[PDB]
Amino acid sequence: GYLKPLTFMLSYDLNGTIKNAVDCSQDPLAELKCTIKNFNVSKGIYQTSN
Amino acid sequence: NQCVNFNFNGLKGTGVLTSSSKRFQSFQQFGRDASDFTDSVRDPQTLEIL
Ligand SMILES: *[C@@H]1O[C@H](CO)[C@@H](O)[C@H](O)[C@H]1NC(C)=O
Ligand SMILES: *[C@@H]1O[C@H](CO)[C@@H](O)[C@H](O)[C@H]1NC(C)=O
Ligand SMILES: *[C@@H]1O[C@H](CO)[C@@H](O)[C@H](O)[C@H]1NC(C)=O
């Protein structure tokens, strides 16, 4: 596979290891997660960045 | 237990005493935290962490 210039959101645990990631350009839900910078989203309507 | 100025390859002047320092993995020297405040640095030759 080939790499592309993309924006990613990364998480670190208590041991300093990467445990989760989100590709912000995949789906509108990932765009919403990357806009508010959280892996959990509450109920509502939000404006998202491009 | 005094207001010192340590040079652990980097300069900063604060106080010092003995640390438990659980979170030291992958050849680490200084245990920084959020807002980049410095705490929990180790002696560069020994393994004790202040
Ligand atoms: C963090 O590392 C320690 C090392 O002993 C391990 O026991 C512990 O399970 C790790 N924590 C997680 C959440 O994996
Ligand atoms: C957030 O989402 C993760 C993944 O589904 C879930 O395991 C976790 O319980 C959620 N956290 C909160 C605070 O609800
Ligand atoms: C480094 O050398 C000093 C003496 O200059 C000694 O006290 C110390 O134990 C040494 N550390 C190691 C890891 O050999």
Phi, psi of B25 (to 5 degrees): -125, 155
How deeply is A20 buried, as exposed, middle or buried, from its count of CB atoms within 10 A (0-12, 13-18, 19+)?
exposed
What is the β-pairing status of strands B11-12 and A8-12?
A: unpaired
> Ligand 1 within 6 A of A17 CB?
no
Q: Is B10 helix (H, G, I), strand (E, B) or coil?
A: coil
What is the distance between the alpha carbons of residues B12 and B7, in angstroms, rounded to a whole number? 7
Q: Say what the alpha-carbon torsion angle B44, B17, B23, A23 is, to the nearest 10 degrees.
A: -90
d(C-alpha A36, C-alpha A16), whole Å: 23
Query: CA nearest B29: which of B17, B15, B16, B47?
Result: B47
Q: How was this structure determined?
A: cryo-EM
Which atom of ligand 1 approaches the CA of A13 most closely? 13
Which chain B residue has the Cα nearest residue A15? B23
Q: Are B16 and B37 in contact (CB under 8 A)?
A: no
Dihedral over Cα of A16, B44, B47, B12: its sign: negative
- Please tell me which residue of chain B has the smallest CA distance to A17: B25
Tokens 């350009």 appear where?
A25
Separation of alpha carbons B35 and B30, rounded Å: 14
Q: How far apart are the C-alpha atoms of A24 and A7, rounded to whole Å?
A: 6
CA A6 to ligand 2 center in whole angstroms: 25
Specify the residue with its C-alpha closest to ligand 2, atom 9.
Answer: A40
Q: Is A34 helix (H, G, I), strand (E, B) or coil?
A: helix
The data reach a resolution, in angstroms, of: 2.5
